[PDB]
């Protein structure tokens, strides 16, 4: 544990511009860092909301590591560093608490390191456990349940108002960005068709392409309504585009009764007052979506302590993992140190008090190795390494 440090700056303590600066431009930054600091390993985790460097073997240069991130970068050591990673992977350090994306981003960080050669066994253990933990926390708790963005909220609302969306048609009117976000969420959920209309046909062709939908004429809005079940209206011009008369006409046009959900994303409003009172029509706003997202976010936050309990349990596990690792690495070294004295010394008894018992010293050597590894175990790691260094320096020279 103690041989790991974490350095970084995040949205928890810095603004969107202090984060940008700190961001590393080069896809190979994790590799450069390893060389420029003689690290055993490193993983670089960077998103719009954090820049964090995990390093193995940094360790008298932790504050320095902090420096090529930012003058207010924090520095975490050992258990705290791993705990922060576990909190990041589990979604606890994200604005959208529990979000799936940050887990994907931790995995990408791990892969980029794997492929650039900046992983060591220790970071493999930590990251592997971090990744499996993020998955478990999201399965065993409710930390990632419930819509916490406008897009996902629109899907919850549509599902509640209309049922299964798979066979529904979405009409998108206008090009406002929040409208594009809502439409993409509906599309990702699964709908049958998307119709796109805009007062400038070319804006429509563009968005339909994005969405995988069909650009339609703005002047045929009545027929569009007649065939649609969810309407996403986000026009830029300040005039309403969905009128009572058009909606009534669209509904009389269709032989089959079914509910229509109209989501008014524009301000001023795209939907004429009174549309909401037409029978089979439901009207909701961008504000209604923000309310849904907020209620769900507030609920996800109440799962944080259950996730934190999972984390402390997992910390104890990885701690023992890392110890077994060091035990394994401690014996192999010591043994190479003691076998080299054994070999050197083997020749010499050969030249005798003249004028295979191979043997006693392979046994005595095994005994010595076990004795020494424990002793280096046995009082710590701040050291362990140098004493492991000392035994090893002394063996090559004095041996």
Ligand X SMILES: CN(C)c1ncnc2c1ncn2[C@@H]1O[C@H](CO)[C@@H](NC(=O)[C@@H](N)CCC(=O)O)[C@H]1O
* Residues lying near ligand X in the complex (CB under 6 A): 47-50, 93-94, 99, 101-102, 105
Could you say whether residue 331 binds a second copy (CB under 8 A)? Answer: no
Q: Considering the rule CB under 8 A, would residue 345 count as an interface residue with a second copy?
A: yes
Q: Distance from CA of residue 212 to its chain's centroid?
A: 28
Helix (H, G, I), strand (E, B) or coil at 152: helix
Q: Give the 3-state secondary structure of residue 238.
A: coil
Task: Determine, following the binding rule CB under 8 A, whether residue 279 of this chain makes contact with a second copy.
Answer: no
CB of 78 to a second copy, least distance (A): 20
| Nearest residue relative to ligand X (C-beta) | 48
Q: Tell me whether residue 78 or residue 399 sits nearer to a second copy (CB atom).
A: 399
Give yes or no for residue 323 binding a second copy (CB under 8 A): no
Helix (H) or strand (E) holding 284: strand 281-285
Give min distance, CB of 102 to ligand X, in A.
Answer: 4
Instruction: State the minimum distance, in angstroms, from the CB of residue 383 to a second copy.
Output: 7
**Per CB under 8 A, does 336 bind a second copy?**
no
Q: Is 330 in the site for a second copy (CB under 8 A)?
A: no
Query: Of 16 and 357, which has the nearer Cβ to a second copy?
Result: 357
The minimum distance between CB 385 and a second copy, in angstroms, equals 10
CB of 398 to a second copy, least distance (A): 5
- State whether residue 199 is helix, strand or coil: coil
Cα–Cα distances (Å) from 83 to 4, 78, 92, 171, 319, in that order, read 11, 9, 11, 46, 11
List the interface residues with a second copy, window 74-103 (CB under 8 A).
Answer: none
Element (H, E) at 260: strand 260-264
Residue 333 C-beta: closest distance to ligand X, Å = 38
Stretch that binds a second copy, among 31-39, 145-153, 238-246, 339-347 (CB under 8 A): 339-347
CB 24 within 8 A of CB 51: yes
**CA proximity to 174, closest of 241, 230, 272:** 241
- Among residues 52 and 333, whose Cβ is nearest to ligand X? 52
Question: Residue 386 binds which one of a second copy, ligand X, none, with CB within 5 to 8 A depending on kind?
Answer: a second copy
- Residue 42 interacting partner from ligand X, a second copy, none (CB closer than 5 to 8 Å by kind): none
The answer to the question of residue 16 lying near a second copy (CB under 8 A) is: no
Nearer to ligand X, 101 or 287 (CB): 101
Is residue 343 a contact point for a second copy (CB under 8 A)? no
Task: Establish if 364 lies at the interface with a second copy (CB under 8 A).
Answer: yes
Partner in contact with 342, chosen from ligand X, a second copy, none, beta carbon below 5 to 8 Å by kind:
a second copy
Please report, for residues 17, 180, 367, the alpha-carbon distance to residue 340 in angstroms, rounded to integers and kept in the order given.
Answer: 56, 69, 15
Instruction: Output the smallest distance, CB 296 to ligand X, in A.
Output: 17
Contact, 23 vs 103, CB < 8 A? no
Q: 121-140 vs 100-116: helix axis angle to the nearest 10?
A: 160
Rounded to whole angstroms, how far apart are CA atoms 27 and 156?
A: 37
Residue 13 CB, shortest distance to ligand X, in Å, is 13
If one counts every other C-beta atom within 10 angstroms of the C-beta of residue 349, the result is: 10
Residue pair 259/161 in contact (Cβ under 8 Å)? The answer is yes
Size of the site for a second copy (CB under 8 A): 34
Distances (CA, A) of 154 to 71, 83, 232, 293: 41, 35, 10, 9
Cα distances (angstroms) measured from residue 176 to each of 158, 179, 234, 265: 19, 5, 5, 8
Q: With respect to ligand X, which residue has the nearer C-beta, 278 or 297?
A: 297
DSSP state of 271: B
Between 50 and 342, CB nearer to a second copy: 342
């Amino acid at each position: 544990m103690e041989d790991l440090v974490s350095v970084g700056i995040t949205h928890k303590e810095a603004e969107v511009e202090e984060l940008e600066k700190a961001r590393f431009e080069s896809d190979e930054a994790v590799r450069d860092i390893v060389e420029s600091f003689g690290l055993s390993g490193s993983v670089l985790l960077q998103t719009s909301n954090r820049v964090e460097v995990y390093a193995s073997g940094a360790r008298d240069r932790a504050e320095e590591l902090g420096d090529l991130i930012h003058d207010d970068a924090w520095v975490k050591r050992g258990s705290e560093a791993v705990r922060h990673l576990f909190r990041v992977a589990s979604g606890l350090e994200s604005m959208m608490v529990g979000e799936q994306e940050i887990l994907r981003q931790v995995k990408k960080a791990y892969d980029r390191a794997a492929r650039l050669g900046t992983l060591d066994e220790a970071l493999k253990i930590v990251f592997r456990r971090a990744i499996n933990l993020g998955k478990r926390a999201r399965e065993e708790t409710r930390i990632s349940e419930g819509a916490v963005s406008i897009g996902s909220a629109a899907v919850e609302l549509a599902e509640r108002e209309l049922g299964s969306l798979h066979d529904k048609t979405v009409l998108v009117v206008g090009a406002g960005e929040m409208g594009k976000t809502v439409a993409k969420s509906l599309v990702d959920r699964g709908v049958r068709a998307v119709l796109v209309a805009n007062r400038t046909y070319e804006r429509a062709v563009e968005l339909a392409r994005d969405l995988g939908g069909e650009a339609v004429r703005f002047d045929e809005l009545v027929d569009h309504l007649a065939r649609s079940d969810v309407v996403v209206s986000a026009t830029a011009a300040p005039h309403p585009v969905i009128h009572v008369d058009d909606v009534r006409e669209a509904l009389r046009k269709r032989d089959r009764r079914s509910p229509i959900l109209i989501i008014d994303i524009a301000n001023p409003r795209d939907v004429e007052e009174g549309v909401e009172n037409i029978e089979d029509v439901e009207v909701r706003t961008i504000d209604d979506l923000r309310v849904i997202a907020r209620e769900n976010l507030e609920r996800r936050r109440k799962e944080i302590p259950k996730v934190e309990k999972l984390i402390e349990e997992e910390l104890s596990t990885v701690e023992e993992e890392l110890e077994k690792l060091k035990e394994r690495r401690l014996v192999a070294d010591v043994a190479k140190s003691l076998h080299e004295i054994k070999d050197r010394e083997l020749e010499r008894a050969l030249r005798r008090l003249k004028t295979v018992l191979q043997d006693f010293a392979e046994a005595y050597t095994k005994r010595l190795i076990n004795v020494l590894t424990s002793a280096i175990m046995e009082l710590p790691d701040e050291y362990r390494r140098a004493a492991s260094r000392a035994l090893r320096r002394a063996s090559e020279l004095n041996g």
